[model samples]
Target: EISPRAITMWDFSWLERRWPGAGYEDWDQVLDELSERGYNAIRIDAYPHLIAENPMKKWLLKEVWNQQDWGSPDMNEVQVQPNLNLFLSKCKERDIKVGLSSWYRLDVDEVCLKLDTPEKLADCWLTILRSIEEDGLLDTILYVDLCNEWPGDSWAPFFAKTYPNVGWGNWYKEESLRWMKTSLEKMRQVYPDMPFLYSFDHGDVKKYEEVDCSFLDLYEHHIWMAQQNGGEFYKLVGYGYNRFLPDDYKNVVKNAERVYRERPGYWQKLLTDKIELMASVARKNRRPLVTTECWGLVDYKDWPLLKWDWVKDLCELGTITAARTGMWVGVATSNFCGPQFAGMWRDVEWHKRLTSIIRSSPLDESLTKNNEVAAKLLKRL
Candidate 1:
């Protein structure tokens, strides 16, 4: 009953990048446009640790990735509580739901690095949740993604110090599972009715088969074509994981279309198969699935000679395939579903059509039951 046609504004871009001529200069207008585009949910980095330190004080946030348009282009200053309240208030006015997440970006103090234990991590999130509850904005939250892409060194650097060699391939390892289980259990004690989960990047499909979803309220897994065939697509495009190249525009322009055109069927099937497998995992776990940052290449931008047409085609294919699964409680049109992507965001009808597919798709019975139980528990709370 609480399914969302979600869009991702990763790493607090909705706040940090909001300067003159920035995409989110006017949040009221942004939320209004999101509603018009048929998006009911948005995922954003809440910066729980940073805000918990002192929400009222101006904090300088370092850029997570300079190449990406998400977050700030340079060091950005933010006063967490005031901006968060204003943003959430506007979202409430528009009946838009928020999906809380954290990229665990650092400030001048690197507060996230200090959260070395699962309890400390959970407590950091609790501080923000309590703050939001005090503002009476808790109802606007759709879910809490404990960490974006769990164990990704760039995002959850704290974990890297604890388990230096652990990655998504070893996510099912006893220690990794215990870390997640402990974190979720601690938070559940305070917000029993809330749906809490750790988002994951698609890696080591074999590991997913052994994953224990009992500790999670829902499943959120990111899917990207670049990761297919052990990163064949990335090789073709000359792109690296979470890193940017000076000639990225040239490389994508020269190779992206050709690769897709040469084996369009192969690319389509690759995405379709991966999505079905992800859905199967969710079905087996009896957990509702949600994918907010997904499909096509993991990174793209509006630049000269970089066409959006082919990328849009891949995204459309992904959206349709995901909708047909019947296991997704929430689905995204594309990761580029923000005002910053002028080429894609200008295509109003495309967003509407994809979101329509997501909204109208029938949920699998098990997934429906999962949502029903969560909804009832939340209502009681």
Candidate 2:
């Protein structure tokens, strides 16, 4: 069984924004500390620029990303991108399972959709993922963040790609999963040891509903909003800033009945329901319900703040969010990375708060006791 909880320092080894220096943040020791503090999983974002070897020279042939397709192989960038094998090695050394982060469709592919065709696209997908699968790089794959919210229609920031419109540049179960399945089929030819998952952008509650029924392995969804944080966006606009301010901290007493005079019913439902949904699936699957991503541990400017909202409510709120949206399966997690954990680890208070919640929330108990994922992992058992 898998654990619903995950820690997403997945991009530590990353450098120059799109370079892999073989060197990484001194996180190996910290990861061990996280594992001891109850962090059972690590979300590793393995981008293209982080390839360790030339695909063409070896397994998947290397190709230039033409027509601005994140789907195409980026040969221009020599950096090997980044991944979790190293971190996972540390994890396995410490008995912690790990997951990989990837995008099914590159922002570029969404733009032109010309070269990264299903066939060529399938080839590229299989090349990287297959290598990971074949190599058994990580426990789960956080694959796909299509709509990953490209504020700009053209997927420029993430990749040198462009789609028809500024369409988050992502596809859900419908387009996304179909690509994923095709890619996976090719990958299966070589490796199928660990499982992979679907990760959305900005917590698209809608995809949970929009996703087709083709893919289902582990359940994972990432949310970027803070229900408890009333309002605070000193910098960075939109939803990414709310969970940061001092006013947004939760002050609920330990084990005390919660009271949110300002919070509406739906707000309560959002949190509670997510927990139940996760729990129900865990119970049904009889395996761990891994959360590939969740909320960021950062505020504006990557500031750190641990609002004591309700760490207790975590285990209580299962898959309500996913169930409400129609998604269920694969590495569950919070937006614990990206701009949040970027450098918050430097702050002692931030680490303390983050660790406290992780310790309070033991995924093994919630998932195993609930008995989710077991059926999914049963494999004819």
Candidate 3:
């Protein structure tokens, strides 16, 4: 048993919610499906809209999109009311733990969002943590997402080329990681039982040494696995990696599941390649790996939506591969909601794939013992 335990997280933003009055309520199925698929823990990208929100609030989300354009409009909107209220409470009643998405940047990332100095950030975090504590949903959650890849250099494409590594990003000076830790420490001061996820970027190893392992227990990564693939047939499948074709070339759909790509069979090759890469990284790091986001779970909009199976195999193969290869391996689910963009279906159908995985056998071992790297590492997992 070498691979880490597998967990799946649902993205509320990816649901379908555009006019026809949203067949919503299918999310329950999504979570159930996750458990059926063998996912253990699930994370919900709870945004301003989903938890304790309304239709008007959701409208505001698009308004923010028009106003800022910082995040993906296809997704990023949460439900107006507490969609996870009854759902999450049900999870607790059923022994399923849920992770909340409370990511932010205050001034840098918000509507009326505000930032604070190290001390204030700490104070504010305490208040928030206390709020969670009082709600009695403490153990119900895994750990906060902590932070997204804080664009240290504003995510300059140069960093990727210059560093020669993928998933390479840094916060401004100490960046969000440093400052976030400072804030988390304050959180720990009040709630010592809380767990955290420290940012672990292999590219930062040369500049920074030692990750706050204590504060950050689990490690994660974001990969555009099919990013480099550019071909014709693949284009017929999806416009993700190959969004830039000659202005003259028309609709590249063969019969539906085909897309033009720079290289034929590139998507399949990339999927297998990434699974192997993830296993290798997990084996080397001694930590469970989770891919935060995917371009489109097989189908972003309405092309073929062959996503569920794609991720399921990736999870199974990646787990055994990592274990056979060795480390802590875990998997999180993809958009448990719907179409990669403004469309979202908050129904219960998605849980079918989610809950299945959570209940399925787990692949946990100690092979990569002590091999997990901190945030300041030199590679990408």
Candidate 4:
């Protein structure tokens, strides 16, 4: 019944870049621009673990990924509860639904490192939810993604320690399933009505049979052209995984466009096939699908020699393909659909055009209509 045109503000960029001259200095302007761009939903790191420790205290947050432009450029201090309330209030005022998630960023006290037990993790999130409810901001949340890209070493360091060898795509591991089920079950006891899920990246279609979707309220899978065919495109472009070295950038600039041009149809077909596979998996699981961080390269920026033209084309292709699936309840234009990426965000018409496709796409009602919980949640929306 609802299709949210979404964008990702990973790790709370709205706060991290709120300094003078930063992109998100004003929440009202940001939300206004986002709505202008036709995005109604935003996914952000709520910093639940950090906020739960001491909501009123100012905490110095270390950069989780130094190579990325999504968050603070360096160590930044922030007042958690005040900023969170202000941000959520703005979202509610604008009628923009929020997707609550956590990147488990490190604080000076390393609060996230202590969340070794599933119960501890659940409790940390419960505290944040309770606080939001107390502030009357809980209704603004559309969904609660327990962790951003679970089992990924970058975000879930605690889980990485327990399963040191688990890769980002290895969502079928027994330990991963056990951890998600335990934490989700605990949280559901407190807020059963809220949709809860653990988003994933680099999903393998072949492994869908091994995944357990019993407790998951929705399927959120992030896909990228850099991940196709065991990363054959990246290999062709000489790009490393999330590494933005000078030489890698040089190679990417020289070859990325040429590689896509050489077999554009083939690449498009590959993406279409992968998306269809994901859609089939979602349909089989009887869970609605939502993809927010997707399309084009896994990582790109407004750097020298890196053109946004080809990236935009791929993003458009991805948007069209995903919208036509009739499986996704939410879809995004691209991961760079933020004010910081002027090259992408300035194209207001492109965003409006793509989001139009998303909102106009039909949802397979069977995915939600048959399920009481999902139907009730959609009805509330």
lDDT of each: 0.79, 0.38, 0.41, 0.80
- Shift of residue 371 alpha carbon in model 4, Å: 1.6
| Candidate 3 global CA lDDT score | 0.41
Q: Please say which candidate is ahead in lDDT: 3 or 4.
A: 4
Better of 2 and 3 by lDDT: 3
TM-score for each predicted model, relative to the true structure: 0.94, 0.54, 0.59, 0.95
User: How well does candidate 3 match the true structure in TM-score terms?
Assistant: 0.59
Candidate 2: 10-residue stretch with minimal lDDT: 248-257
lDDT (Cα, tens digit) per residue for candidate 1, span 32-142: 888888887788889898887888988887776667777686788887887887888888888777889998878888888988999999999999999899889999887
Clashes of each: 0, 66, 105, 0
RMSD of 4: 1.7
Question: Which runs of model 3 end up more than 4 angstroms from their true locations?
Answer: 1-6, 14-38, 47-59, 63-84, 103-109, 116-125, 151-168, 171-173, 198-215, 228-286, 292-299, 304-329, 336-381
Query: Which stretches in model 4 have alpha-carbon errors above 4 Å?
Result: 242-245
Using TM-score, give the best candidate's number.
4
TM-score winner, 3 or 4: 4
Ranking by lDDT: 4, 1, 3, 2
Report the candidate with higher TM-score, 1 versus 3: 1
In model 3, the Cα lDDT at residue 177 comes to: 52
Worst lDDT window (10 residues) for model 1? 372-381
Q: List the residue pairs that clash in candidate 1.
A: none
Best-to-worst TM-score order:
4, 1, 3, 2
